[PDB]
Design a protein around this ligand. Sequence first.
Ligand SMILES: Nc1ncnc2c1ncn2[C@@H]1O[C@H](COP(=O)(O)OP(=O)(O)O)[C@@H](O)[C@H]1O
Ligand code: NA
Ligand code: NA
Lengths: 298, 289
Amino acid sequence: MAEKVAVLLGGTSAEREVSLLSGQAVLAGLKEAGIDAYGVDTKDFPVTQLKEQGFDKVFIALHGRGGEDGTLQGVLEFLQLPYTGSGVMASALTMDKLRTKLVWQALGLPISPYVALNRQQFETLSPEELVACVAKLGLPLIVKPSHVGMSKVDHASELQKALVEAFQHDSDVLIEKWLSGPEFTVAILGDEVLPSIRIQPPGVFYDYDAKKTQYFCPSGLSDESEQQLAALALQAYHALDCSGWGRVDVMQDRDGHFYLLEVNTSPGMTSHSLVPMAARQYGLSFSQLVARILMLAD
Amino acid sequence: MAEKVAVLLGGTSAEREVSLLSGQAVLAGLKEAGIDAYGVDTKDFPVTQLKEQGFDKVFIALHGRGGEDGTLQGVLEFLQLPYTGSGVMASALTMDKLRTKLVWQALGLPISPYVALNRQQFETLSPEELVACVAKLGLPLIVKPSHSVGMSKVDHASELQKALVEAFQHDSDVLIEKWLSGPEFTVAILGDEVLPSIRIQPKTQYFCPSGLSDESEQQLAALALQAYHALDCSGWGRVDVMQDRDGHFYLLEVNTSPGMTSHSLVPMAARQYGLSFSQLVARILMLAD
Ligand SMILES: Nc1ncnc2c1ncn2[C@@H]1O[C@H](COP(=O)(O)OP(=O)(O)O)[C@@H](O)[C@H]1O
Ligand code: NA
Ligand code: NA
């Protein structure tokens, strides 16, 4: 028998409005492919009831907290419903920038040189010893919470204020060597790597506000560089145990080498979002994209 | 007025019978400490209804699949009920022996030399090149799925193939590790306190105190705490460690919902630390908020 598919959308995260748009687009793409899909605004409907309500399969179009962080995936594993995108471990692990980095680093994959600091070290160390802890990174530096509170630090004297700000939001903090850019993103669909996209933010960070931002696809990279980036992205994604689909974010340094930033396990699916753009460049319609993502669940 | 606490127990995993015992003990320990606790056999009661039923707080005494692997923790996070033990990420990460190892290794923490192999490499490689892939590990070897089902001790290179075939029945990632001559220890952690280690001898024998010197116990306690924080654990858990012939410690794994029967490891360590079983479980619950 045919499957009843729930498209989970909206929710209660900061990204609710983007997720309503993603879910609305996904819903229309699936129906255009003949899939018996229904929109479910998880703000109003508890995801714990999906099986009771008769669903066989779930397409996840939520973003942020409660969507791409393992929680929802856990609920779905408890109900034993197949769902799109990565599983519990990978969905959660990809929210943790420290542990993401550690896994990549143990596998010899390139990440920006950095220093991790917990609250305990922050409380037992003088600024001066903090400066010495990060001296080997040079300048300038990025300071961020391991899971908002981000700063660019240009001079050693600015470090303290940045740490204080970052520890407001988290008990683990990362201090990274600044990378010149540019920034890229690489979408992955099943085992296929899609064409990369170069991203130019209006300011210093490709942050929430930036997500005036410019996107280029094709990225402008040479063919050799694209092949390198594709292979690297795939490794980065398999390293964190991702599956189904996702987006890998990457940055160049001044030397032209790539460095891994993060993997996003529930990407934006609006008409103007990154994955649909890359899919289009790859030769897929939006409807084909979403039907393919669904087919890769289970 | 008082918080209503659910002790989740039993369930449907292979470890159901051990979990009924753990839950029964926890339930009695919490009541003895003055907590309004109720036993909830998750085989018969769906965990998705805990809030509807009026519970405010959950003590998790399930083991194995659906208890200590992130899925239950996800349900509880969705319901927004405070619960005992580690969160989603840590509960799930600790079931992945490859990624556990990789995180520990990137932090410079000690683990046994090993090789990881996926299905693709297994399918592309002959028995002879497999042997050569692991030659640097010496003999004997432990072969295990990355996620003791499907585990073997391999004593001779010619036995490697059969062990890999068995292991790939259960997983697409397999670990081949250098065998360690022992002894084995386990270190219970409660909030930020490290409890006394227990030496485990493979009719199974447990020694607490472990027999280690004071300086070695301090080293082990610090190492265990780092291993636990490395994987983002909280609330409580058990870290398993082994020695090599020279006395160096190596991290094996972290367990995010340990056994709580009368004869289980964590209670034995708590007792040696000076806590009654009732105090132990009250402390664990207090760590949930
Ligand atoms: N080491 C770095 N050097 C330069 N820019 C960085 C660095 N790390 C992150 N960025 C910029 O900050 C943005 C956001 O940080 P990121 O680590 O991707 O996490 P989050 O998604 O939580 O903000 C990136 O997309 C990129 O523009
Ligand atoms: Na994620
Ligand atoms: Na676990």
